[PDB]
Amino acid sequence: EAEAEPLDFVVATEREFEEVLAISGGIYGGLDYLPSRYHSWLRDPDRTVVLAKRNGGVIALESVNVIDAGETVLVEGLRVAPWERGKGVAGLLQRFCSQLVKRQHPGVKVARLTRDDQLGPRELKKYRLITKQGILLVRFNASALLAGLGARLAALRTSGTFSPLPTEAVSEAGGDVARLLLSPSVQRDVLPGGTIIQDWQPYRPSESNLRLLAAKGLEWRVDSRARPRVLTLCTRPFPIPHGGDGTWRYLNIDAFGSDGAQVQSQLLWHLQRQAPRLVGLNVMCQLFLEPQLWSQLADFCQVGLGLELVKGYTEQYLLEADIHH
């Protein structure tokens, strides 16, 4: 039997927040960002958050955000209520959003997205793979980490097993971020596929996108400003549904470059910066890094720092497709 009422595609408002939460159970294994980000998304000037409604009720959501100086649309948040799946809803919503972008933003030439699902024949036919990073996910209680880290690092140093390597400060206000990310050699030799990936969001390295990044409260670290080889990027932690008790936060660190020892020392630096602000909370810390470094960093986190590995090796894929008419 066909549905009594038609689908209606509308721009999201704050009125639908609770309905959106109610269709989002279990998404991203409890690491879903949308509960914490929905209000922000509605304020973003180049973003359209589209809801599919049936008979006045929200059954699906998709975000399209225009970045890269008008040339790219990033697709995020695609989801259909569990009780409405398998009927083509996501396909219809994707088509509505793509037509909306083509109508309102004629300058958009490509769509981009990131995901960690295994790429099958269907993905490889439709998308280009721009780059990929390995994904390392660990968990810790912030207070417990802070209480033991001094002793841990002391024992690691006395044993000659590990001593933090020097790292260098990176100030956005001071211009260090722009001097790094606008360098053609940093783009070629450090950034994965010449792209900034920040908490799953890809940006071409341009001044326009640096303004967007500057507003997010990111923290950066580098091995050397004068001779950059490893650059790390920490996104401010945010609440996630995992655990159901409100105590969990997601701490995303993107690591760019090939020197595993510098990724280790910069990871430690970010943990020491961020954990004091999370006293009383629990942390899902997800590190993205060059694939050949994953085993080294997994051992550093598990054996060196005593952190619990949540899952085995997976990959973050940056995918791109051309816009067609």
Residue numbers in the entry: 47 to 371
Paper text:
Here we identify the intracellular NAT16 as the human histidine acetyltransferase (HisAT) responsible for histidine acetylation in vitro and in vivo. Acetylhistidine is synthesized from histidine and acetyl coenzyme A (Ac-CoA) by a histidine acetyltransferase (HisAT, EC:2.3.1.33).
The crystals of the P63 space group invariably contained a CoA disulfide. The first CoA of the CoA disulfide bound to the canonical position and aligned well with the other molecules bound in this position except for the 3ʹ-AMP moiety that was poorly defined.
